[PDB]
Amino acid sequence: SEEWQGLMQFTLPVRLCKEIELFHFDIGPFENMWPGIFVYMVHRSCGTSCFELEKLCRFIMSVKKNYRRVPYHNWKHAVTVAHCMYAILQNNHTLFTDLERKGLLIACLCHDLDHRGFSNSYLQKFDHPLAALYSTSTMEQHHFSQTVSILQLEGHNIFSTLSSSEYEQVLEIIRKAIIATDLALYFGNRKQLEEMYQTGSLNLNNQSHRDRVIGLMMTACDLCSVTKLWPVTKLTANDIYAEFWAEGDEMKKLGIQPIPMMDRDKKDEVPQGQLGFYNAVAIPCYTTLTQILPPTEPLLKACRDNLSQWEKVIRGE
Amino acid sequence: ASICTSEEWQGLMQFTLPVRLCKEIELFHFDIGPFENMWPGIFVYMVHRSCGTSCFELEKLCRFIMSVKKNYRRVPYHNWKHAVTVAHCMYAILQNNHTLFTDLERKGLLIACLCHDLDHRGFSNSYLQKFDHPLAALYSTSTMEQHHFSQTVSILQLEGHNIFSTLSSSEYEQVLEIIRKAIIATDLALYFGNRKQLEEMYQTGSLNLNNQSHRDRVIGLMMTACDLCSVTKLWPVTKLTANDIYAEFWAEGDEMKKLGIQPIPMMDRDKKDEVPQGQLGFYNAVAIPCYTTLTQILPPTEPLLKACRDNLSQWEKVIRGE
Ligand SMILES: Cc1ncc(C)n2nc(CCc3nc4c5cccnc5ccc4n3C)nc12
Ligand SMILES: Cc1ncc(C)n2nc(CCc3nc4c5cccnc5ccc4n3C)nc12
Ligand SMILES: [Mg+2]
Ligand SMILES: [Mg+2]
Ligand SMILES: [Zn+2]
Ligand SMILES: [Zn+2]
């Protein structure tokens, strides 16, 4: 209980007071500060007197305990996703309700809690007890379950000054928000919102339209490494493949063949895999997000910049 | 026909190209995919850089473009993206052969390409015929293609949509004949006729470009290299567009099955397994021979052949397990 004492004390350096507000900030070389960076983003965006520092700090360090030393789905990725949602909300400061803004920063930070570095596919094919438990969106539901568990620990419950509803409300925002980071649901989500933007039936007074927009915002954040500056971006993909290939290897060890994406032998097709992933997933995501919320546009511009870079890699420039 | 709203052409006018595309848009394998908002503006940039800045009055152009866009459907392959993709390819062929073609052919070839699949229902020349469609009653060879051009004229004739405003009546009836011929020749059923003669005209040193009927033949083949240029893009783009081609076909195959009739394999989703061999078969029967004869006639277009070879190997790899 002295981890969360060395967190109450943190002051974000003035030199980062601007850098952080930029959509393309790389938290990468600020390891020590990451839990202080998140304290900063919460305060700036939700208020200094909405979470009682201690309970907030208690929370954050515990969440941090509960992320494993995997190559990609780690503490560095929680913060990075949290950061991006900060940037989204800051640039849209009016659309989102007090209760949402708090939920979403929290939901982002726990969204991959206690990941083991295994896809849902993997968990389900090998009848692992988490697949036994949640047939669909397997990891995502554990993540949430794990959010619930850290909160119910002594003195971690940061929502203890809220109505019955108000408490069951925010968690629900978090539930739906964490679930939405199952990428298999993203495709549906995005196609509904597209038809709803063309048609024009899109209504932000409708709470199930709110859900889909928040949904998409979670994908955008989750995927946000494709929006960083190219060296960060290049590097963070290496970490992605390292997670996948360790899952690929684990499959070989079982006399079973992994897919190419998970096949380190296939290192070479990486750039074309990225280009494929940008055209099929990333770009449409940031494209529709921008349609819905215009200020999010530097997300799409940077995504286009990295797509070019991946093209150049493939073509030899 | 359908009018386009006011606001549509007014933003189109204010639009400006990013300095990094100006570089990439000139290149053959350039993919327009990730710049949807920019497409109608990519057309202007393209027109202007090919046919001049006062070729047409922006206002009239922009109206036409936006009304060309809205007369495309949300079908899977033959849509607004495909039209601009085909226009982009023309542009890049023109640019590499810029003085081989009259100012008047480049205006008309770029519009033709923009308009060459207007109001595609999502159906083939065989379906419409076989099932005695109105359109099939109206036009009985090159069915949709004829309709595509009928559709162009209709868009030409609309208060403010006529971009051949300032043309002599003579030149007006000329650019309409470049366009007609260009569009019809996108009927792939004709390509095989066209390519054999061109191939023949090539092996004898008798092809001549100031010979008009040889000109039209060359133009038609340009229209084919453009219609198929998705096979010249980088692999992950080629594969993704293949998905959309098949989405459309299989949607048609599904209609036939309903109607009491068995689709050809290409249109039957139950036959996916042979996709690679359909691709392999199409690259050898159709596309490779397209870009080979194109590069013999217009050697700067060669990067189209090289990229077509690149993706032919990819389908071959896809084939052998890999
Ligand atoms: C989930 C996610 N987030 C961010 C990023 C930048 N990525 N990149 C991916 C993987 C994209 C991908 N790579 C391949 C691939 C690579 C080498 C050989 N074969 C491959 C086949 C499919 C791939 N995909 C979808 N997933 C993600
Ligand atoms: C009209 C067009 N333009 C571009 C491209 C890359 N394509 N590719 C096609 C389909 C080519 C094709 N597919 C099959 C096929 C597919 C599954 C099963 N059997 C098949 C038999 C022949 C096929 N062909 C020619 N049409 C096009
Ligand atoms: Mg996750
Ligand atoms: Mg056509
Ligand atoms: Zn994540
Ligand atoms: Zn076409």
Side-chain angles (χ1 to χ4, degrees), chain A residues 1-53 55-164 166-194 196-271 273-317, chain B residues 1-6 8-19 21-22 24-158 160-199 201-322:
Chain A
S1 77
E2 299 255 351
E3 227 174 296
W4 58 249
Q5 280 180 34
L7 180 52
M8 275 204 50
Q9 277 325 293
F10 187 86
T11 303
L12 188 76
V14 270
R15 48 157 211 272
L16 301 170
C17 270
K18 289 320 259 260
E19 271 232 296
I20 284 196
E21 303 284 309
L22 291 176
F23 283 97
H24 62 264
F25 180 62
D26 179 27
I27 76 162
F30 304 116
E31 181 130 28
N32 292 168
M33 311 186 212
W34 287 340
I37 282 170
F38 177 93
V39 170
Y40 182 94
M41 295 183 309
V42 163
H43 283 172
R44 292 234 63 164
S45 150
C46 316
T48 36
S49 277
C50 221
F51 291 136
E52 182 258 321
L53 201 46
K55 280 181 137 187
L56 185 64
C57 288
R58 281 202 175 97
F59 190 71
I60 299 162
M61 293 314 271
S62 290
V63 168
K64 186 189 189 283
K65 280 177 177 160
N66 287 280
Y67 269 108
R68 320 197 165 190
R69 330 194 140 269
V70 282
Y72 186 60
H73 292 113
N74 44 49
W75 172 239
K76 178 169 181 187
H77 160 81
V79 197
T80 295
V81 173
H83 174 275
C84 184
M85 174 58 78
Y86 172 70
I88 278 155
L89 294 156
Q90 293 284 97
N91 281 271
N92 288 266
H93 106 298
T94 114
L95 183 76
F96 306 93
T97 71
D98 288 350
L99 211 49
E100 282 170 344
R101 291 210 299 301
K102 299 202 284 180
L104 290 177
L105 288 183
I106 293 304
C108 275
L109 179 75
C110 308
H111 98 274
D112 274 328
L113 271 174
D114 192 40
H115 206 279
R116 288 101 194 278
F118 288 124
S119 68
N120 298 343
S121 297
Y122 190 98
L123 298 158
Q124 275 143 36
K125 79 190 278 79
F126 303 126
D127 213 346
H128 196 271
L130 291 153
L133 183 44
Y134 328 109
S135 28
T136 54
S137 294
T138 303
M139 278 315 292
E140 292 70 29
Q141 284 217 254
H142 177 87
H143 296 321
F144 177 54
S145 167
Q146 287 298 90
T147 303
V148 176
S149 309
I150 290 176
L151 286 153
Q152 289 176 341
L153 298 185
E154 189 40 56
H156 283 71
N157 204 352
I158 40 179
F159 299 121
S160 60
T161 50
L162 293 170
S163 139
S164 172
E166 213 150 34
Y167 183 87
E168 8 153 31
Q169 223 206 297
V170 73
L171 300 193
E172 193 67 17
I173 292 172
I174 281 143
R175 190 184 60 79
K176 296 163 163 180
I178 299 163
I179 307 306
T181 75
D182 182 0
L183 186 63
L185 308 162
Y186 145 71
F187 300 95
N189 193 44
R190 224 261 333 164
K191 205 200 163 167
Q192 317 293 304
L193 292 168
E194 175 98 325
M196 282 182 179
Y197 192 85
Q198 279 166 22
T199 58
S201 61
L202 194 70
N203 194 331
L204 289 322
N205 304 297
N206 181 306
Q207 175 80 76
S208 73
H209 287 191
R210 295 195 78 76
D211 290 357
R212 299 185 167 286
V213 170
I214 287 171
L216 185 66
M217 290 162 47
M218 289 306 292
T219 307
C221 295
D222 205 4
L223 296 189
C224 78
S225 82
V226 301
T227 63
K228 303 294 164 197
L229 274 176
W230 172 251
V232 198
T233 302
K234 179 178 115 210
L235 299 176
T236 294
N238 276 354
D239 299 346
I240 301 160
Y241 290 102
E243 193 150 307
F244 290 152
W245 298 331
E247 190 201 312
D249 300 331
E250 279 309 296
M251 284 169 110
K252 280 159 179 175
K253 286 146 208 185
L254 264 48
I256 298 168
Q257 210 59 58
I259 69 145
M261 183 174 71
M262 307 217 207
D263 199 335
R264 61 168 67 255
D265 274 4
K266 313 303 184 69
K267 279 179 199 232
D268 282 329
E269 302 172 49
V270 163
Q274 286 302 296
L275 192 82
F277 176 83
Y278 279 62
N279 277 294
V281 188
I283 291 296
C285 170
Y286 294 116
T287 298
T288 300
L289 191 72
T290 278
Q291 293 180 314
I292 300 169
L293 304 158
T296 58
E297 225 215 10
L299 287 177
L300 176 63
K301 152 189 186 265
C303 193
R304 291 165 173 157
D305 292 349
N306 286 310
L307 189 148
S308 311
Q309 294 293 328
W310 280 118
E311 236 151 300
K312 295 180 166 70
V313 176
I314 296 163
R315 282 191 320 244
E317 290 161 53
Chain B
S2 284
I3 297 162
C4 64
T5 90
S6 60
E8 298 197 358
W9 66 261
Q10 303 197 37
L12 175 42
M13 281 186 45
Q14 312 186 264
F15 172 86
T16 313
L17 217 87
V19 169
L21 306 180
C22 292
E24 300 219 62
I25 204 180
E26 300 292 317
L27 294 194
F28 286 109
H29 50 77
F30 171 81
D31 175 23
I32 75 158
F35 314 104
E36 178 162 27
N37 75 299
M38 290 190 217
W39 297 341
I42 290 164
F43 196 66
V44 168
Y45 175 90
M46 280 188 311
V47 167
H48 291 199
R49 289 279 281 207
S50 201
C51 301
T53 36
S54 55
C55 179
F56 310 109
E57 274 95 76
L58 218 22
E59 160 177 332
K60 281 203 153 200
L61 187 60
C62 293
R63 275 202 184 94
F64 182 74
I65 298 191
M66 298 311 305
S67 312
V68 156
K69 168 185 200 306
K70 220 197 195 92
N71 288 256
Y72 275 95
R73 298 180 192 269
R74 39 206 57 136
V75 284
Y77 170 70
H78 284 96
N79 50 36
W80 175 242
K81 191 200 178 155
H82 163 72
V84 187
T85 295
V86 169
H88 171 263
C89 191
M90 194 39 87
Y91 170 84
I93 292 151
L94 296 186
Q95 289 280 99
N96 292 269
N97 295 270
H98 176 275
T99 46
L100 288 173
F101 304 87
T102 60
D103 172 84
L104 193 48
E105 284 150 330
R106 308 187 316 260
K107 311 184 204 282
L109 286 190
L110 285 192
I111 304 292
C113 282
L114 201 63
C115 293
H116 91 269
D117 280 317
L118 277 169
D119 209 85
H120 199 293
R121 275 71 221 268
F123 294 103
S124 81
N125 279 337
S126 276
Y127 184 92
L128 309 183
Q129 294 194 305
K130 198 95 208 217
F131 309 91
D132 326 288
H133 203 260
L135 275 190
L138 228 61
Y139 329 101
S140 23
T141 42
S142 301
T143 305
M144 277 305 308
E145 286 82 35
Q146 275 177 302
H147 184 74
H148 293 314
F149 167 75
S150 216
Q151 279 283 301
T152 317
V153 186
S154 314
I155 296 170
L156 282 165
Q157 327 160 335
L158 252 169
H161 293 100
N162 193 330
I163 51 167
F164 301 125
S165 250
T166 64
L167 277 218
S168 84
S169 181
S170 173
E171 288 181 306
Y172 175 107
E173 270 190 318
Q174 262 148 292
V175 81
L176 261 72
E177 206 58 16
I178 296 167
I179 280 169
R180 209 190 55 87
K181 283 177 192 177
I183 287 178
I184 303 319
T186 62
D187 186 357
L188 207 31
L190 304 184
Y191 147 79
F192 306 95
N194 192 52
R195 194 259 171 185
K196 273 201 92 203
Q197 307 298 296
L198 280 163
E199 168 77 318
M201 299 173 188
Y202 182 77
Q203 306 301 328
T204 72
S206 57
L207 185 72
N208 166 44
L209 267 32
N210 331 121
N211 163 350
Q212 189 49 12
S213 84
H214 293 196
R215 206 186 186 80
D216 303 359
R217 282 206 180 276
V218 164
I219 285 181
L221 181 82
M222 282 146 66
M223 288 300 280
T224 314
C226 292
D227 208 16
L228 310 187
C229 70
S230 93
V231 303
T232 66
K233 310 305 201 177
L234 292 179
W235 176 235
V237 170
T238 310
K239 203 161 56 286
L240 264 200
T241 304
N243 292 327
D244 298 336
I245 294 185
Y246 284 108
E248 184 165 299
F249 290 165
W250 299 329
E252 195 189 293
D254 288 0
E255 299 298 343
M256 295 167 68
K257 282 182 188 178
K258 279 170 205 160
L259 283 161
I261 283 179
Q262 144 94 353
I264 56 168
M266 179 165 86
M267 273 159 211
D268 187 336
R269 62 185 66 242
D270 306 346
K271 298 207 173 176
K272 288 162 201 271
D273 284 339
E274 302 184 339
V275 156
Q277 196 75 253
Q279 289 307 306
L280 206 78
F282 180 94
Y283 276 69
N284 288 321
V286 183
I288 288 277
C290 185
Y291 303 101
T292 310
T293 304
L294 192 63
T295 303
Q296 285 170 334
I297 308 170
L298 286 181
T301 77
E302 183 226 82
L304 295 171
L305 176 49
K306 202 176 30 181
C308 189
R309 270 138 183 198
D310 295 345
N311 295 307
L312 164 56
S313 318
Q314 290 296 294
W315 289 119
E316 273 176 10
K317 290 187 191 139
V318 139
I319 267 180
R320 312 169 297 237
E322 322 141 51

